[PDB]
Design a binder for this molecule. Structure first.
Ligand SMILES: COc1ccc(S(N)(=O)=O)cc1
Length: 126
């Protein structure tokens, strides 16, 4: 069901939260080799979260679930903001710009924590 596919998408999101926090620790400790691997893992994880989310939106649309479509359209826009920041962090890491990596790191934490409440509304609406 779309609701179970959303619980599966939410766990994939939680994975990225967990990986991101051990990356943040590794960045702070100067462990670039770890950061690099964590960035690659997060990239696959965000790619999968986005994929699960598009399928759920498309299915909510096919189902005519108007409220769920509205909330998912907002949530996916917010997701893309997160993704654009993540991609900027990855570039900041490639360039050795740690001041911008720090910035992008903190931005992505505020975009994910702010998106939290909406994600909690979609679970109910599907
Ligand atoms: C990578 O950008 C993201 C990831 C997750 C979320 S949330 N907190 O699940 O809405 C928002 C943006």
């Amino acid at each position: 069901s779309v609701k179970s596919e959303y619980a599966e998408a939410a766990a994939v999101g939680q994975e990225a939260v967990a990986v991101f926090n051990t990356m943040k620790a590794a960045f702070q400790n100067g462990d670039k080799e770890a950061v690099a691997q964590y960035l690659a893992r997060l990239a696959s994880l965000y790619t999968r979260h986005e994929e699960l989310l598009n399928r759920i939106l498309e299915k909510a649309r096919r189902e005519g679930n108007k409220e769920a479509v509205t909330l998912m359209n907002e949530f996916t826009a917010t997701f893309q903001t997160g993704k654009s920041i993540f991609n900027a962090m990855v570039a900041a890491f490639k360039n050795g710009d740690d001041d911008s990596f720090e910035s992008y790191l903190q931005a992505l934490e505020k975009v994910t924590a702010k998106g939290e409440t909406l994600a909690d509304q979609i679970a109910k609406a599907l």
